[PDB]
Symmetry: D2
Subunit: 114 residues, 4 copies
């Protein structure tokens, strides 16, 4: 099944943050309405934040997270969780190799903000 794709309420600000846990340099691309809206690049094996930014879901509300290492797409796992019918978390994990820890690039999207 497709992973890393989330439908957020339209024209809503959200945060996107990425953590790295791999020897390979992680390239995280965030698309809004199928167009790049943010790109984070970094390397860490200690969960360092390689990027964080505030974006707007726009008219479509479509947000997609892509993760690649040296141009090769990583395998993604994702899900959305809503707490008290208000607080949203769009979660993404990714695997660039064979150990399957799926934490090589961890992306967290949260809303609402403010």
């Amino acid at each position: 099944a497709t992973q890393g794709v989330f439908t957020l309420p339209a024209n809503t600000r959200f945060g996107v943050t990425a953590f790295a846990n791999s020897s390979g340099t992680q390239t995280v691309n965030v698309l809004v309405n199928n167009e790049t809206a943010a790109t984070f690049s970094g390397q860490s094996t200690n969960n360092a934040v390689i990027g964080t930014q505030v974006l707007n879901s726009g008219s479509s509300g479509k947000v997609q997270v892509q993760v690649s290492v040296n141009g090769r797409p990583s395998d993604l796992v994702s899900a959305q969780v809503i707490l008290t019918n208000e607080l949203n978390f769009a979660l993404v994990g990714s695997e660039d190799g064979t150990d399957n820890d799926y934490n090589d690039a961890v992306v967290v999207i949260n809303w609402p903000l403010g």
Copy 2:
């Protein structure tokens, strides 16, 4: 925080099912747009299904689950999880006593159907 309240897409069919794990008789009430739409009553300490039904979220999409034992409201815990940005689960747990297993009445709402 409020628990057991979920905003579903409008006019969408969904399933609601309740399981019981308590000495006390569980009364599960499901409200749609603040009006009763289903009521399940049963007793089991072996996770028996005390009720299952198909409902429609209506114009408001507001769905609220209430659980009580002998007229006394149980304490609720809940959350919504979305898989592959399509499959939805609105989950509710409830505690009628002091052991805090929160499974006395377990309610699962799922959509889409068909």
Copy 3:
């Protein structure tokens, strides 16, 4: 990534219930420690419960859900959610065709029981 596999606490009773939403007959197989422990078969396009049963996670705690239609494995989506650090839900969705509603066979595993 692998889906439908969950590690439950050892020797713990859990419930497993399956719902069907497809023209095709759904075959849900539940494995505990890689050995069949339950099999549900049914057909419904109205979220009917095609099976529910209480199982024990055993010494390994490994539980895997398989879904197939006419012998063909469906594509699975899954996740585990824990509420108040006590109530557990192991969720599985499955797609047997091309519309991607992933509800053809919906499986819910819950614990603790009693």
Copy 4:
């Protein structure tokens, strides 16, 4: 029900990161085995990261997140989500006022690392 408490596997490294979305200064305290292990303090209404750190769950695996503003405990909401039976997210939201957006202090715990 109690919120903000999570049982992680013993002696496992995990990351904890906090975001702020409130006029009030957020004080996030992380306890491991009931003893303070990290404290973040900051103010932002734009989801700024007020802290991030790597901790070890220790022998007990008990991790608890506390959030307060000017010494007053905020109301918490939380849940744990596991993807592909490997990637873990312990999520916490908090409300310091009356608008109930529960994002005043957002805390994300993730593991495994490396």
